[PDB]
Design a binder for this molecule. Structure first.
Ligand SMILES: [Cl-]
Ligand SMILES: [Cl-]
Ligand SMILES: [Mn+2]
Length: 170
């Protein structure tokens, strides 16, 4: 694994806590993006990582005049356009629920009123992989309708190994 190799080299060279904390955050971000890619492959949807809300709206509603709607500058991992409803996608890889509750509050407060003014049915969807158990949790009723089964095959072992290696240096 080329990414694994880069991380191992960073872990070998690291000597301070600030850099060590940066490596760990980079491992988690790589694991998050790994899950996002595998999730999009399993659902047969286009993979994106980070898209702006105004770009989503311009994608699904090409003739929109954005200025009329006070569209905040806000990023999400991905979206699904069904032809009649917009699903905002956030991927998570976590054993807890807290980051889901923070993100859900943020997107429901920032995205849903704009889309309501536009008149486009929208749902905030958070798909979370537990990295310890490999269980998938979904927030988002219409997402669970469209995707009752998620044939993801996930292996987080490489990320656990790198984090353990970094932690074994303390
Ligand atoms: Cl944002
Ligand atoms: Cl995450
Ligand atoms: Mn995410």
């Amino acid at each position: 694994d080329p990414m694994y190799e880069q991380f191992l080299q960073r872990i070998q060279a690291v000597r301070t806590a600030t850099v060590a904390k940066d490596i760990s955050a980079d491992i988690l971000e790589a694991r998050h993006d790994y899950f996002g890619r595998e999730l999009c492959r399993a659902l047969d949807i286009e993979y994106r990582n980070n898209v702006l809300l105004d770009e989503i709206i311009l994608d699904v509603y090409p003739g929109v005049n954005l200025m009329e709607y006070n569209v905040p500058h806000v990023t999400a991992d991905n979206y699904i356009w069904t032809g009649d409803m917009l699903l905002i996608l956030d991927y998570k890889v976590s054993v807890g629920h807290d980051s889901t509750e923070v993100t859900y509050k943020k997107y429901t407060t920032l995205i849903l009123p704009v889309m309501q003014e536009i008149g486009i049915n929208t749902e905030i969807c958070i798909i979370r992989a537990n990295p310890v158990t490999n269980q998938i949790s979904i927030v988002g009723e219409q997402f669970k309708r469209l995707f009752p089964t998620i044939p993801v095959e996930l292996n987080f072992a490489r990320f656990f190994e790198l984090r353990k290696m970094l932690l074994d240096k303390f």
